[PDB]
Amino acid sequence: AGITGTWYNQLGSTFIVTAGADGALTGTYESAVGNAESRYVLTGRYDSAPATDGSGTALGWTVAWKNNYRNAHSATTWSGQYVGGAEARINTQWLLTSGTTEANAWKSTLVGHDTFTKVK
Amino acid sequence: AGITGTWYNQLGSTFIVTAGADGALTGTYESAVGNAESRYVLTGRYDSAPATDGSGTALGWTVAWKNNYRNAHSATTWSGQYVGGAEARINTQWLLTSGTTEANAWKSTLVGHDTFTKVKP
Amino acid sequence: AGITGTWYNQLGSTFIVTAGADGALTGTYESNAESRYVLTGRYDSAPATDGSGTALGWTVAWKNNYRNAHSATTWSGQYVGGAEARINTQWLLTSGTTEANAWKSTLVGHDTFTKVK
Amino acid sequence: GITGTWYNQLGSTFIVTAGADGALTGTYESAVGNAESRYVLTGRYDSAPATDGSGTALGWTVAWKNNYRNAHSATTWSGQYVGGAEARINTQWLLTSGTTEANAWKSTLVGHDTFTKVKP
Ligand SMILES: COC(=O)c1cc(C(=O)OC)cc(-c2cc3c(=O)[nH]ccc3o2)c1
Ligand SMILES: COC(=O)c1cc(C(=O)OC)cc(-c2cc3c(=O)[nH]ccc3o2)c1
Secondary structure (H helix, E strand, O other), X not given: OOOOEEEEEOOOOEEEEEEOOOOEEEEEEEOOOOOXXXXXXXXXXXXXXXXXXXXXXXXXXXXXXXXXXXXXXXXXXEEEEEEOOOOOEEEXXXXXXXXXXXXXXXXXXXXXXXXXXXXX | OOOOEEEEEOOOOEEEEEEOOOXXXXXXXXXXXXXXXXXXXEEEEEOOOOOOOOOXXXXXXXXXXXXXXXXXXXXXXXXXXXXXXXXOEEEEEEEXXXXXXXXXXXXXXXXXXXXXXXXXX | OOOOEEEEOOOOOEEEEEEOOOOEEEEEEEOOHXXXXXXXEEEXXXXXXXXXXXXXXXXXXXXXXXXXXXXXXXXEEEEEOOOOOEEEEEEEEEEOOOHHXXXXXXXXXXXXXXXXX | OOOEEEEEOOOOEEEEEEOOOOEEEEEEEOXXXXXXXXXXXXXXXXXXXXXXXXXXXXXXXXXXXXXXXXEEEXXXXXXXXXXXXXXXXXXXXXXXXXXXXXXXXXXXXXXXXXXXXXXX
């Protein structure tokens, strides 16, 4: 699959993931520093039988921003595809939703994009 | 009362979820739209200790659209919040990314919004 | 075309628009003069006649003669005619930020507009 | 500033004028999709940005109809202009097609484009 291992995005975030045989993604998401207060559980899913025509491998995962040290009352989902090779990449778009009151729900969700590589 | 239960979106998709004490979401999703049949595995995360100021509970989950019957070579993530009440609701926005070639990657990702209720609309 | 006129979203905003013969959208977006802003956009002036909606989009930059939020919203969507006509949209709201804060510069959401408030 | 000729990462050409009243006007030539030749664009920008180093917020729309083709669709780009040595406009976009109600769930694509003064 090529997905299991450590990945790094353009802002230094570190994505430590295992791609299980039946489509599970499990691991930890942390900052470049890696201190415990910066580490969070992640879980997701990937296509464990991708096409063989040169297409990428679809995947997604979620981090809720709560750990044993802090709680930002929010969660991010990344949706994207893995592209293999010597310059392997995971190319994603993400949504970060915070818990809000109904009056503030219109501004609950940020959108962005992250690219991950196997090299810092 | 809470996130654990059976939910339906505005199109009649069925979201059967369990919210574990450790912040885990697990369960199955059945889509009313697209190249999909029967149940698919989902996993995700939710805030197990939400704020006490009237705010909703943040959460997210992923389905990869492969099961024993079909494989669409794609995955959806839903990002949103649970809002308690007499008509409990989960309001989400979603991203659906297909595996593509690089030349087709610009059109790889659909976006939308789904609202879920424990009463089927 | 059915687009020209006054529209109301789900949260009390008012969208006043003219759909010109050349594909232009022009008008004002509100929420009193302190809360009114120019909008401009484009729509498909020759949509299909097969039950499909009419694609369109517009932008508001949140500056007027009284206030300036240093931000701008774009709405992308389609007009759906009939007895209960609608403009169904998704939107992106980008703020001007420093580079260090750019990762959190953009909100996303959805607005539904009706011809009755 | 914003007025000039810009190119996205895929080679699309964005020829824009930023007027004194906050107006964006010009033409767009897409490098992808059911598109050919130039299309009209209109939009808006913040004509009095902050003076603290922040970017200038802006947005614009293209409806994909011209004298040669009609894709029955429209794209909006929302983003900010970042001045300096190599000026850049960083955007996210939404591309909605006209659909029936039963197909509306798949009506909207999302992505991100970055524009510079140099061809990629
Ligand atoms: C409310 O968000 C938070 O509390 C929070 C906290 C941390 C943290 O503790 O860094 C150690 C990191 C992020 C974060 C978000 C994010 C994102 O959305 N796309 C790309 C990566 C990424 O990292 C968010
Ligand atoms: C007080 O200034 C305003 O009127 C104002 C200010 C902001 C702001 O502070 O963004 C920095 C945002 C909006 C706004 C409205 C709106 C809408 O109706 N649908 C979609 C998004 C959206 O954003 C309006």
